[PDB]
Amino acid sequence: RGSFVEMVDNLRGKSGQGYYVEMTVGSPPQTLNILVDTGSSNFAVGAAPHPFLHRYYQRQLSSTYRDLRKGVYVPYTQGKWEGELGTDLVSIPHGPNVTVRANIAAITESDKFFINGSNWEGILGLAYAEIARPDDSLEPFFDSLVKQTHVPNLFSLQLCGASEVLASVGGSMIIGGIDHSLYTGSLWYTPIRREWYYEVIIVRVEINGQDLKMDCKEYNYDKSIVDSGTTNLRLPKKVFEAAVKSIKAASSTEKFPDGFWLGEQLVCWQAGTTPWNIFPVISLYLMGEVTNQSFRITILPQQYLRPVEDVATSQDDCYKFAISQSSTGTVMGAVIMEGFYVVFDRARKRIGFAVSACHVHDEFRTAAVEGPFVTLDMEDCGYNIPQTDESRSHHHH
Ligand SMILES: NC1=N[C@@]2(CO1)c1cc(-c3cncc(Cl)c3)ccc1O[C@@H]1COCC[C@H]12
Ligand code: NI
Structure with a gap:
């Protein structure tokens, strides 16, 4: 094939x-x-x-x-x-x-x-x-x-992102294999921690190369999942707050309303003048197949600032901030997935990421998949969801 x-x-x-x-x-x-x-x-x-x-x-x-x-x-x-x-x-x-x-x-x-x-x-x-x-x-x-x-027990997804109607999007779902035309560079795999959601483990988060320096369990509280059925990158409360602070700090030349950071208000620039370079890259390090290894997936503002063409301001390019708070863990939605060709390798209990041939970037920065990163004596970054009596009582015959 x-x-x-x-x-x-x-x-x-x-x-x-x-x-x-x-x-x-x-x-x-x-x-x-x-x-x-x-x-x-x-x-x-x-x-x-x-x-x-x-x-x-x-x-x-x-x-x-x-x-x-x-x-x-x-x-x-x-x-x-x-x-x-x-x-x-x-x-x-x-x-x-x-x-x-x-x-x-x-x-x-x-x-x-x-x-x-x-x-x-x-x-x-x-x-x-x-x-x-x-x-x-x-x-x-x-x-x-x-x-x-x-x-074969595998599928892969290439989600490609974008006045009266919303913008049309496109992509590919390849069932039973991997299509090499849909990505460039290295394909990196993170383990599926448990087969329920497509659950993964994040070991480190950086905003413009700056480590958020949280206990890594915070990144996966109470889980981290890869979800084509969610638009945003959703982050646990503590992580969201730290990320927003860092992105605000980097983009501080502009003073946006609180509504923007809440995803409740668009911000606009005159056509083609969007200052992409004031917004930082975001890197999520995912646990590698090898213990003590990780690799990073890096997304651009082109992924986390979503284009919305409003009628009244059709002369302008307008954007929604698509990183949002979660109380149910990290959700790597379209904001993450639009950067990458994502391989759901069920047969081998792993998820693959590679730079997508269709991702939106500029001449200065690209979405990236890079590794390995090795950590001596890597901690367990997984969270163990408290067992309810409801869940415990279930028989699994
Ligand atoms: N994973 C996920 N699936 C959920 C919620 O999260 C979902 C999402 C959307 C939906 C609506 N607008 C945009 C997108 Cl990307 C998805 C529409 C229906 C919908 O129903 C799903 C029903 O099952 C629980 C999870 C639900
Ligand atoms: Ni029984």
Whole structure:
């Protein structure tokens, strides 16, 4: 292999509203646009009329649909979806040339799930069974794909970032391999700490080469994950505050409102005059495959300042600050992923990063992937989430 031309450029979306892939469900195939989400584990599709849907999965039109006679209820921080579990035939038209029978949650009711204008009608959770709903016995889509076909247990994502409409985004999801045209330089791997989310360990953070000098467990409190289903780089409270202070200090020639640093207000410059060089690079050092090694991924303001073309100020280039506070750990969302070709090597329990052939940069700086960095007697930077009685009581047969 080494080339997967048919799968290149198979992702689309609107800026800040997620990346989606075309999928088919049912016999004959019904096409739907599906949000690619490495931060969840259910395949769920709109299956009833909704104000924001032009189309939905019509179960009655599929000769191959089977009802599982079981519902599923999925509340989360920003919304809720619920529906009926079933199985049907699924394919990815610009993916592997295979058809699999997968679990499909037919979304019958939701709140704040669908987005007006995002153009997606469902979600493809690519994470592990441990976080599937209702429970871990509901086989996720990728597991079914691997078990039913000869598709290698690996996928990779190249997310490429950007007056009346939001900017169109594009990218590639390569299923079953690595496409060498999508990256340059070295491909560096960090271990998947545990198979639930795509959990990783950050060992060090630098802002313009300056170490934040925190106990490294703070960087992974209470976890750090790689999440295509999050736009921002989200950082634990303490880390966020230290980062903002450092970025403010570096960009201090400009005095932005508090709203900007909160991601609640755009800041603008006259077209093509954005002073990129006043904003610092951000480096996250990730644990290497070798104990005592790390490598760093470095992003630019071109990644963490998101372009938004507002109607009133269409003469100007306007930006949203896309680093935000978390209480659920580090989330390496599109802000991180748009710099890199990211390999989800499930077979080898590791995540690969390389400089993306499509990342946004200037003639002075580039997003980078660099290593090795060796630390004598490296500490354990992993956080151990307190075990609840709820979690502990679960039997895992
Ligand atoms: N990983 C992740 N998945 C979440 C939340 O975090 C999500 C995200 C978005 C979404 C909306 N706008 C932009 C993007 Cl990138 C994603 C839309 C729906 C959505 O529902 C998911 C349902 O499962 C829990 C995690 C949810
Ligand atoms: Ni038991």
